[PDB]
Amino acid sequence: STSKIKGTRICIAIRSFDNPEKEAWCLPPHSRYAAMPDTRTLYTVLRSPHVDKKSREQFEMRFKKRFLVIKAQSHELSNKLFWLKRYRILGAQYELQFHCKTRLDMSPVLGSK
């Protein structure tokens, strides 16, 4: 199926200046792949160290983001976290999102029902 993975899982958010698809080998294995919009920031500077007001040069800074989905059951999350702590992705910073489920203890509040 192509429906959304909802449950126990890992989500990796990778932010970079370059495209991560240029070096695809350093990415972790994953179930799903998607991309976010690029974000640009504009700078306009004077060219001269003195009065040349109408001459400008325009630079930009561009941010790129990618989203990875990993399906994982409850027993192997602590196994995968050890390796996920030690990765080396080229020119990137990654974000580890953890989705897990526990249960509620009702004993100290069941008196109030």
């Binding site: 970079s16 001459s55 602590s78 050890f82 080396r88 910073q93």
Partner: protein, 467 residues
């Protein structure tokens, strides 16, 4: 609206930057660190008259979480070709001598370099030499059969284990104590049973199974203390010990399981370098022994035989020879055949790692000629003009004559007071073959440099095209 830098137009495509990282909260630290490190590295070991010097062409910096990698590129020395045992002055002029709840947190920094910090490598070395020394006979058997396997079996070579382990205190309680201290210092509840999944690889004895279940039940339901009549029962309650020693056997194999030292060997793989001095180590191993064996005993055997006749405490002579071996290594100064280049590189990595709190690495590459980057060519021209020997036409002619092939054109501009008699500064430009900067799929490199002179500042610009 004037002529601009060639690199800025083709920075994205057809070229790549010298650094690779990303941050948003820590951008201002890295954008300063790049500029500061590249400004520092270019002023190290300048060429004298009798030295070729350190000529850095491109410095490549890669940033990873807590690990930073630096790659240097240097040209080979152009030259036409054809002791340690006694040294002095390389040593010491003096042997020295004549809030319980109200604690403080970890201090942070965001924008610059950390403060100067004492190191921990002495304690790490002390832990590693007297812990896990792998001289145990329980570890002696496994290296024997791995030596049998490597020299005779090709299926061991064609196997991923060889390709990782050899790219051409027992450890379990150590990790348990590590995990206990790391959990109790940050005040998270430490259950040691769930730690045991680290010592687990998921990829007949049912009587023992039920006996273990009931032997865990008998230790769960008990321990209601303050009773001596049942403390006698606790004394005869050593069926927990039966459950302990039920699973025992003779083991022939060591452990390469539990991925915590697998990661240590994984880090050892990628940071070995290219240099080792085991030959110079083993040359001194058997010679310092015969030096220290014949040094003592020079009509001064009376103190040694007094030490022998005192008691069986001879092992303080081991501390005596510790002091003497420290004295003899300190007097000469610097290791025996350790390369000075790797000495300076290691000394460089040490202060970089301490100031930034990472584990930085330095990898060097030697290339064939100085004509492989505009920065190298401009540095060469500036060093040639620093002592006046040649004219500008002669320098350009020599560069054109000994330029290597695969360079599709060159151009050099000199500006300043070129002629000594005249005061009005002019510009001289020399060109050769194709230097069309307006084609964006060409490979054009550019570099400036400034020369101090008697009459001010001279300037040199270099454009070079590649095929």
């Amino acid at each position: 609206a004037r002529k601009g830098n060639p690199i800025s137009v083709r920075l994205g495509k057809n070229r790549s930057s010298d650094s690779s990282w990303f941050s948003d909260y820590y951008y201002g630290k890295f954008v300063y660190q790049d500029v500061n490190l590249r400004s520092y590295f270019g002023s190290i070991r300048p060429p004298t008259r009798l030295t070729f010097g350190f000529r850095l062409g491109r410095c490549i910096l890669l940033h990873f979480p807590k690990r930073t990698f630096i790659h240097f590129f240097l040209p080979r020395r152009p030259r036409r070709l054809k002791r340690w045992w006694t040294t002095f002055g390389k040593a010491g002029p003096i042997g020295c001598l004549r809030n319980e709840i109200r604690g403080w947190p970890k201090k942070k920094q965001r924008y610059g370099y950390h403060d100067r910090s004492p190191s921990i490598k002495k304690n790490l070395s002390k832990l590693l030499r007297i812990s896990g020394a792998f001289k145990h006979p329980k570890y002696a058997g496994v290296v024997n059969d791995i030596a049998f396997l490597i020299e005779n079996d090709d299926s061991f070579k064609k196997t991923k284990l060889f390709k990782f382990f050899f790219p051409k205190v027992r450890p379990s309680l150590n990790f348990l104590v590590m995990q206990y201290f790391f959990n109790t210092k940050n005040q998270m509840n430490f259950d040691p049973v769930v730690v045991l999944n680290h010592f687990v690889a998921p990829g007949r004895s049912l009587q023992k199974r039920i006996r273990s279940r009931i032997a865990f039940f008998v230790e769960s339901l008990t321990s209601e203390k303050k009773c001596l009549a049942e403390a006698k029962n606790r004394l005869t309650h050593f069926i927990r010990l039966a459950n302990d020693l039920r699973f025992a056997g003779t083991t022939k194999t060591t452990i390469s399981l539990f991925p915590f030292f697998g990661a240590t060997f994984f880090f050892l793989r990628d940071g070995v370098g290219v240099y080792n001095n085991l030959d110079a180590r083993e040359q001194l191993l058997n010679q310092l022994r015969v030096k220290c064996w014949n040094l003592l005993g020079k009509d001064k055997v009376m103190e040694l035989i007094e030490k022998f006749k005192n008691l069986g405490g001879i092992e303080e002579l081991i501390k005596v020879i510790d002091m003497m071996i420290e004295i003899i290594l300190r007097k000469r100064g610097i290791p025996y055949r350790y390369n000075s280049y790797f000495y300076e590189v290691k000394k460089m990595r040490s202060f970089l790692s301490n100031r930034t709190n990472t584990k930085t690495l330095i990898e060097s590459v030697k290339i064939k000629s100085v004509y492989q980057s505009a920065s190298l060519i401009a540095q060469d021209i500036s060093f040639q003009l620093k002592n006046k020997r040649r004219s500008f036409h002669s320098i350009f002619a020599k560069i054109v004559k000994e330029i290597p092939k695969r360079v599709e054109g060159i151009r050099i501009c000199f500006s300043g007071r070129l002629k000594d008699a005249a005061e009005k500064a002019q510009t001289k430009c020399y060109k050769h073959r194709k230097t069309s900067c307006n084609v964006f799929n060409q490979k054009i490199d550019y570099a400036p440099v400034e020369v101090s002179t008697r009459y001010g500042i001279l300037g040199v610009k270099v454009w070079i095209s590649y095929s």
